[PDB]
Symmetry: C3
Amino acid sequence: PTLMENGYTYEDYKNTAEWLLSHTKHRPQVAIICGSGLGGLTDKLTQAQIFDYSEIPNFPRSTVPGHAGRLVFGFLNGRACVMMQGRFHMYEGYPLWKVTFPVRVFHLLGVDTLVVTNAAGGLNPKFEVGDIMLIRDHINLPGFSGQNPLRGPNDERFGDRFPAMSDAYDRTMRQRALSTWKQMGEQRELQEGTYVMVAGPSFETVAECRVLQKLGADAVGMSTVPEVIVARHCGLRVFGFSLITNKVIMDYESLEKANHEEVLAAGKQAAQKLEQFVSILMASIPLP
Amino acid sequence: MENGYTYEDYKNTAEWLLSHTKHRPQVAIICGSGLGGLTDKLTQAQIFDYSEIPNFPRSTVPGHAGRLVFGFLNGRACVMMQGRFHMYEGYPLWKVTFPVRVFHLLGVDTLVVTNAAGGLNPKFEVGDIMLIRDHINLPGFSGQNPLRGPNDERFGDRFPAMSDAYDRTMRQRALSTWKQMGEQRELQEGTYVMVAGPSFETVAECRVLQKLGADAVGMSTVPEVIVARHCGLRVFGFSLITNKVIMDYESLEKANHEEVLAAGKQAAQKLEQFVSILMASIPLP
Amino acid sequence: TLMENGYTYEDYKNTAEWLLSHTKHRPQVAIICGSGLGGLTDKLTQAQIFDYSEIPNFPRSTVPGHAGRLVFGFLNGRACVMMQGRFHMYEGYPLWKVTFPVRVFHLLGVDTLVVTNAAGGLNPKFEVGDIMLIRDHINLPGFSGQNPLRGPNDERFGDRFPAMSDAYDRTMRQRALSTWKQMGEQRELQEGTYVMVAGPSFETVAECRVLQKLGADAVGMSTVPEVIVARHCGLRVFGFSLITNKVIMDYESLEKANHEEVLAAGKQAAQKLEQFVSILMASIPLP
Ligand SMILES: Nc1nc2c(CN3C[C@H](CO)[C@@H](O)C3)c[nH]c2c(=O)[nH]1
Ligand SMILES: Nc1nc2c(CN3C[C@H](CO)[C@@H](O)C3)c[nH]c2c(=O)[nH]1
Ligand SMILES: Nc1nc2c(CN3C[C@H](CO)[C@@H](O)C3)c[nH]c2c(=O)[nH]1
């Protein structure tokens, strides 16, 4: 009982992959994880098939609202997709080996690209709510201290022992998302910066917000990084963005408080603009 | 994963207390290392051993008596933790903070937390009292947070805010009321950074902690605060700066608990006077 | 439900006695050899080799370039025991297993521990192949729970609350520094802060920026727990890194840190390492 490794065996991921393949004719190339209140990104998929997480062997469940807890296969702008409508978080009590389960089943499914979205608190002063931020890079604070989904024995059928994360955010797609933005009719620029992961479930104090700023983080949240780390370890291309849902309180004067109701509501507002952005992006994702 | 205590556990404990004392506290006071001497002014004091009270962890560090004391302090109905619990003892934060949810079930509506702290701000001297204006939860950042796991709505919200954590009224009130202490040392206010220990900082660590903007360092307090706010208790916090953390390589001085307890003892009368004035500052239910 | 050392005092004693029974060596100095640094055992004389698998209670090393062997012998005429490879948190080990050998080294009679490691270079002044002497460390896993001393403290080993501000011996530093002018080079000995990070995956550019701005000169994934328990039981401690690679600092670079080049830089550094370690041995005080 000493060793802290994955509770999931390789054949565990396999069983789930298989089950999915025997239960849908869809064969996705792109997997999309929808953050808090962003569950609306599945609206535009055609010929859609829905599975409740409860149906899928080994799948965790979403306990936080509104993470719908459903897996959805569809086409989006020429491309076969699978979408996580709701994700999992460390703060819910899950070990990162659970949080990230689906990612390696996508790989066994044959997905070669993963897009990750999340709600995120604004740390950079010139962001505004409703801004989409292209995740250039992240800072894995839980990672530094030992909280990493890769911890334990490493299966080379999936990846290396020491996989480099410094090219994690696909540079090609950044450049393409950038100029693709001049193609939407938008007032605000597409935002770019570093996402810092923090465990939660409680929200930053003012001093904490200030370390995070000092650290160089542009946005804070409690997800996403584990998933990126396991994706890149199996060689998926990774592309991420955060929806800026609130500016995290950076002075003792404010009487504003960060809260879930407000973040879910910044999500419903933007999901429209979001889905379109994701839509045009699909035709930018490189073919297998 | 999850908190090992069911809701009934906290209830059992509260009811045990509610039927073994007639005291009904409004304020709960957690006593840090060398601050155990603050139960001394409790009138009509009633004392329990942590080992009597169902589900109570034990205090295993010297300077932590392992005793729960109900009484009145400068008129106010208090219950005091004479000794506390740390993460480095091998306790999950859901044990470290356990009493706090119980106090809430007792009807306590205010929590004061006290600790010893190392001084990061060069302006601080041993003996100072630093009001906890804010904290940095370094262990929180990576998963060690007492709220981790399923949330019980009966206590609070899945995502509670912490930027309002330390009552601005009670701090400002404490700041003005400080001239009654007859002191020449000003009253300090700054940031507490929790660090898990049990080993003391390197010079290099001291320096990250400084440049992270923190004024004092300890290994306690933050989890308790977090769960108190989760259930809506008013929170006041202060630190006794017991040592100045080592910030250069040519000093031959080094942090030790003995110096910590020694400085606790030195300031025992000044704390007691300060905490007394503080009971006059808490709003009534 | 208590996070706690899984080893009793008796376990550390069972292991130490076993070594004492099976070897005639009585080591004064213990050396932990990191990734790709195994060849430091080469210059040991009258050597005797134990596979970790033979040693009661010894963990095993699963990373490549960590041989998994305990080697006794003399080096520059000093009685050493060398760990041929070590253990890391990322392997799934609790810090109380990672550092297990150190207390047994202590029960063996060892009074000095020298920790060695590979490290990514953070300080722009460092070249691949430099030896940075660890003047100090930053213990990030320690900041948030991960410390080998967590749980009940055994007072037979040391304090409930030990100081680390003096962890790396000043006198050994200075002696090592001034002794460097011989089989020295046009390249100086480096000195600086090791930051420990858990891994197993390598730093992003952003993470690399936070480490730099935290004051840290080199990054690795071990060592610090070993140092903490060494000082717990009052061993003199000396540390150094081999800068095996420069951590990626900007987004257009196409280089990526990889294990293979960590090990290569090690084999490339063997001779200079050998020379240094034995010049170090001369700088270690006698009982
Ligand atoms: N840590 C943090 N996370 C977020 C998020 C992202 N998630 C939103 C949800 C809480 O509303 C958690 O799952 C984290 C939005 N804003 C913030 C913030 O200010 N802070
Ligand atoms: N981390 C830290 N804590 C303290 C404390 C607070 N407590 C003192 C006690 C060890 O003496 C621990 O339980 C933490 C006083 N001084 C210091 C210091 O220099 N550092
Ligand atoms: N974190 C980190 N560690 C190392 C190390 C030290 N060890 C090398 C090995 C990965 O090859 C791990 O055990 C850590 C060398 N280079 C680096 C680096 O760039 N980064």
